[PDB]
């Protein structure tokens, strides 16, 4: 029984180090692979926090610590239930992977290159801006891949799980060689 | 007693919980008082990560674990050592406390209401968009306070430790009476 059992310090050390790397050599949604990994770390954080409080409850020094550790664990796992319900409801309205994510319950859908590109959205305002840099399209903080200005979509949609909003392309401009700028305005609102 | 390590479980329980709260309630900047706090936390992940690896190099289980803990601590040291070098050099050009943030090395300066508003900018590109919602200005993810479209600045600047860029107001439009939209195009580049 007289063991150190302190190897968890290496486990937590590496976990913190992973967070530093994600926020330093990635952070920005430059590609889908890094973004997906970041979303996983933002998910696993839930059971890790929960476990920390549970251990305090199990090896509690006294009943005061026990009661507190249990109450704290009850909150962290009370929120996870929420993360789920909201994600499930979004999924039920749509039919895509992106419906399950810790950041937001609103999706942006932009038709490109013969198909539709979907990303999580943290906005849903009257006006959505778009910027084209060296032939690449960037919207709402996400890279949507290659798209020239002359072929920029005239319609995009946003799904909030309660309502469906349709946006229409307004004025657009070219700003040097293959760069430019555009904006979308809500034109219609439908309900689910 | 066994070092009453249950206390360390409580500390990490609370520290992790802080990130769960910040990333759910203090997202997308918005309130300057939440943003300025979030920036504090990230500045205390280099000493926490380091302490975890350093402590493990004292309470060693074996030589292999010790060697790894030391190597990892060394790497975490080199991270904090860059943040300090980069921040001081930026400060030398732009004498503002915003130069000491643990996110980026670029500052955005937008003149408003008789003064100049400064915020961290994630990247410097040819075109910077601006959105006005119900009389409030949002640029590069930051809220810069109240600004009507008719009062929108004709020039903004972006400063780094090496160069200085000036952006000229280009196109603008009113959308929905109170809301509106504009874009800024880089027109001049300077050095230092």
């Amino acid at each position, epitope marked *: 029984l007289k063991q150190l059992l302190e190897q968890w310090n290496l486990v937590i050390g590496f976990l913190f180090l992973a967070w530093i790397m994600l926020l330093q050599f990635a952070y920005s949604n430059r590609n889908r692979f890094l973004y997906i990994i970041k979303l996983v770390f933002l998910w696993l954080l839930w059971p890790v926090t929960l476990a920390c409080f549970v251990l305090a409850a199990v090896y509690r020094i006294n009943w005061v610590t026990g009661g507190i550790a249990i109450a704290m664990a009850c909150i962290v796992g009370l929120m996870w239930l929420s993360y789920f319900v909201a994600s499930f409801r979004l999924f039920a309205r749509t039919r895509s992977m992106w419906s399950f994510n810790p950041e937001t319950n609103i999706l942006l859908n932009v038709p490109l290159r013969g198909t539709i590109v979907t990303r999580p959205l943290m906005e849903s305002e*009257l006006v959505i801006g778009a910027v084209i840099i060296r032939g690449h399209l960037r919207m709402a903080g996400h890279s949507l891949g290659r798209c020239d200005i002359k072929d920029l979509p*005239k*319609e995009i949609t946003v799904a909030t799980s309660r309502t469906l909003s*349709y946006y229409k392309l307004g004025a657009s401009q070219r700003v040097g060689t293959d760069s430019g700028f555009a904006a979308y305005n*809500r034109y*219609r609102i*439908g*309900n689910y | 007693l066994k070092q009453l390590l249950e206390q360390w479980n409580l500390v990490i329980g609370f520290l992790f919980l802080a990130w769960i709260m910040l990333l759910q309630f203090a997202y997308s900047n918005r309130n300057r008082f939440l943003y300025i706090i979030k920036l504090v936390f990230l500045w205390l992940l280099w000493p926490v990560t380091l302490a975890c690896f350093v402590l493990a190099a004292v309470y060693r289980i074996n030589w292999v674990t010790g060697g790894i803990a030391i190597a990892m601590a060394c790497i975490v040291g080199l991270m904090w050592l860059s943040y300090f070098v980069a921040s001081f050099r930026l400060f030398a050009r732009t004498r503002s406390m915003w130069s000491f943030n643990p996110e980026t090395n670029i500052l955005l300066n937008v003149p408003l209401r008789g003064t100049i508003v400064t915020r961290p900018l994630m990247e410097s590109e040819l075109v910077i968009g601006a959105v006005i919602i119900r009389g409030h200005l949002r640029m590069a993810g930051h809220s810069l306070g109240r600004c009507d479209i008719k009062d929108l600045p004709k020039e903004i600047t972006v400063a780094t430790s090496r160069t200085l860029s000036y952006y000229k107001l280009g196109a603008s439009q009113r959308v929905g009476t109170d809301s509106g939209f504009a874009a800024y195009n880089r027109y001049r580049i300077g050095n230092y």
Partner: antibody
Amino acid sequence: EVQLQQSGPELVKPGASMKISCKTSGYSFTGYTMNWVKQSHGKNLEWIGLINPYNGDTSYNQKFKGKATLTVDKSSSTAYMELLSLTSEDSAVYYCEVINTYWGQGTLVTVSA
Amino acid sequence: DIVMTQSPASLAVSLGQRATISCKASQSIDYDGDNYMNWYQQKPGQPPKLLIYTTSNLESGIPARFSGSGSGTDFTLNIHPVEEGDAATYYCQQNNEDPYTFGGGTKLEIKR
């Protein structure tokens, strides 16, 4: 640039059914919604329904429900409206529209013996 | 089942004079403080075209002579420098609710 070519006029008896075939071109077939209008005798615009050619997910109002079926054929870049149990009040100029901008030329439907 | 009506049945307007068409809604819309209302134009033998969207956003390709405004339940279409080519039927659409509805249509005639 963008076209919405109609199949042309047709005449049927009461109780008959038909399919209105709209052929488009100039853009990728999917990615934009489709809307139908009736414009009945006289000068009155009306909304029949909306569909998403990418995956279905149709939506109708409560008055035209059961009177029409809206479908799509991705292989020919077309969209169809199936007219059910046509009566004397169904004679009209039917046509497709995309985003309140582009319209078809009009398919004249006459219901009469 | 949201009813919209226009006040005039038709207008008789001389060249160079302002023409106006008004419309009222049974509902205030009020979505995040924004009202919705589209205005359309139709000529004989042709499908309609959109002129104005969301109460005030002029459609591209439409001349500035067409100025839309209003708020709440009161919507107005103002055509100031009326010309000889402005001879068409104008319509309203709410563009806010699942049972989308249109107005009755107002006919513009030009005096000569």
